[model samples]
Target chain A: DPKVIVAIDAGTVEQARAQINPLTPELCHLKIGSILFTRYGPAFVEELMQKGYRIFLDLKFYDIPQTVAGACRAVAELGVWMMNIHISGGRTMMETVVNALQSITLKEKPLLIGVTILTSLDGSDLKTLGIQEKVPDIVCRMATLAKSAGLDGVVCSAQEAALLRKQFDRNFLLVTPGIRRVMTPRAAIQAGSDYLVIGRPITQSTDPLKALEAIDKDI
Target chain B: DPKVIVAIDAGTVEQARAQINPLTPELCHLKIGSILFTRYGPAFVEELMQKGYRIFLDLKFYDIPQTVAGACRAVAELGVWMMNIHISGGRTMMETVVNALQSITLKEKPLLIGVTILTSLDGSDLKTLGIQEKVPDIVCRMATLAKSAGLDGVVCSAQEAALLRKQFDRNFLLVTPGIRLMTPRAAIQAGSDYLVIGRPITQSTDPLKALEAIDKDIKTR
Candidate 1:
């Protein structure tokens, strides 16, 4: 399976489909996130799936333990290959999702992932939220919690991918989002990314397939 | 104005409508969150709104600024009375949503409320997240930022509502969840503009009767 996940971050269904239809899922796993998932709804994820794509639905659920578990169940029923939640939701919330997804009988269930500090956050941002730890230490702590709670993987920047490879087992997946911007795919793989999630670089290219192939080989 | 916002926190559409059909929009507005909304999709919110209810669409969006703004705009076009985001999404994201929402031409836009640390967090929880400040100071800090960013108000605990009403203007909306358990109209007295009641009403032996009892308690008080 391809390690590069092309994030379908479009404003309209047509725009998203145009990006998706041209790019085959064999080259990359399609990621449908809030921009598309919220705009067009979950049916679109089904549409993408029907086209033989493995979708990583990226709603990043954050709420009460019960509500978070409920939302995770809804996402699970979508039969997505992967989904994520905010680890800040606490140990109970993360564990609730792990236990909730267990009973669903699909061909195979989605990989339950946890998010650390999003690219939107930095030191000033964390300080504002009343968290002092910057990206390095905080993302690590969050990932540690996610692992302890029985999550399958994590979604963080590429650099932290290197950080976690030290402590995490080889099978523990690390799905890094800020690829090609902060570092190249080769660097990302070297840093220990199980999957490099690229959005604008490939999806925006004139030849998305070729663009993806080039990056695919680079790693 | 009616303060009891019944939480439509059910698993399926039938459960949600069953929760809604028995209640009066005039007596209480409805709160439909991710569980129902994500399950049945945005169409359900429209169905409830068409049933003559004011919907508090509680997705609590937290993402990048552009993504948060886009999701909020999508929610806005559905024409719900109010929606909320995590104040933790920070000033940039909050202001981004405020700006994104202005372009929509609804009769009156949804109230852009912010969530200040969901009920799951406490001293230990915040400490675990590396947020050393306790609920009072942290919620206050978040609400201050929400107000500054031109949010309609915040979703916080009943106690934090009291802590904020002192500093925040009366017009600044304060929606407090955990109501039936949080001392009901006492939350209203503690400066809660709206009280969120879910299972205490819906999961009761007689839902509509319980709703009526709650409606009476808040109305008479």
Candidate 2:
């Protein structure tokens, strides 16, 4: 089922469990990013995996072709539900990741996605990086590179999702950030984002389950 | 002190130990790259550390600023002697790594190096990646960036090391790969701080003797 990925950004393991215990895998998946992973490490991910939880290990891997391949293989072995890489890693590197996971059973391999233009970046940031393109243009180029390398999909902004859906087939996934109250979930889903990532909306809510259910209202 | 790092690329832990048990930290360090680190995981590295080995964890992290910081901090906690990240991670990311280690004691913090161009890449590869510069040009810019971020040094080719040596002060390390007579010894005379010898020592039947032979051949004298 199309689901919302809860960004687990708790300060303590107790706090993380408080968030996870209430949310069922059917309703949503969890995204374990660098902060959580670094603080608790892989043991926390393994704990959730053992309980049959789906995890998006959001490490945003970016490295040489050989190293990134090995990193992806190890992440797959950990039984994550999904993982992502930097689209900035380029075509050869992304293709290397796809080829590296070939030995794993389909069941064990996590869903791979490419992260287009990090939310923290903007036109000024791109100019600083020596990239001539604007934010939207770079995201398009990044998404195009990801698709050409045969990635399952890309994590792009909702504003760009519809344009991409028009450009590519639906089978290519479009995973977007959640809790953008500016637009409705139903709107983005119709436009073609497979999963929405929720951080503060669901996490800080007085009732997270209801909040999750609220977002899924028109789905 | 011997300035060699015999890469532990054997297929199994037993094989790795066979190479490792004979070579002490006094002679050379062990570099655990992706293959061994992926297959065996951190337990294997911890085991080697407990036995008094200085490991150069060659994971070469390349990611956004905070994410790469987390990765670097975790690696430093493991007590490895050295670790690396790609210079392409950019000034902000590389600077973040240096700042992340501030919490760690000077002793525990690994000597961080930025990888420039991989040995596997060439002109066509760089062209595809949208990098217009030639190999040495890229390496020079990468090394300059690393230096600007206060990185310990870089992993560059022997030929480029002399120029880098001239550009940066002597304190900047240059970890290089090796073999052959002129190239190996000359690499040091030109400026590489340490020569990383893998297959010549790893693939040999008498791995220790092979390393010793290479060490004998490459000394500055």
Best by DockQ: 1
Quote each prediction's TM-score. Answer: 0.96, 0.86
* Cand. 1 Cα-lDDT: 0.84
Off by over 4 Å in 1: none
Residue range B1-221, candidate 1, lDDT tens digits: 57889988879987777777778877789998888877777878888888998989888888999999999998888888999998878889999999999998786888999988877865666877788768788888888899999999999888788889999867899999887647787898889998898889888878778877877887782
Assess each prediction's global lDDT (C-alpha) against the native. Answer: 0.84, 0.76
Classified by CAPRI criteria, candidate 2 counts as: acceptable
lDDT of 1 at A19: 85
Residue pairs that clash (backbone atoms under 3 angstroms), model 2: none
lDDT of candidate 2 over B103-174, digit per residue (tens)? 775575678998977765556545444555577777887788788898999987788889899998768999
TM-scores of chain A, one for each prediction: 0.94, 0.92
DockQ of each: 0.68, 0.32
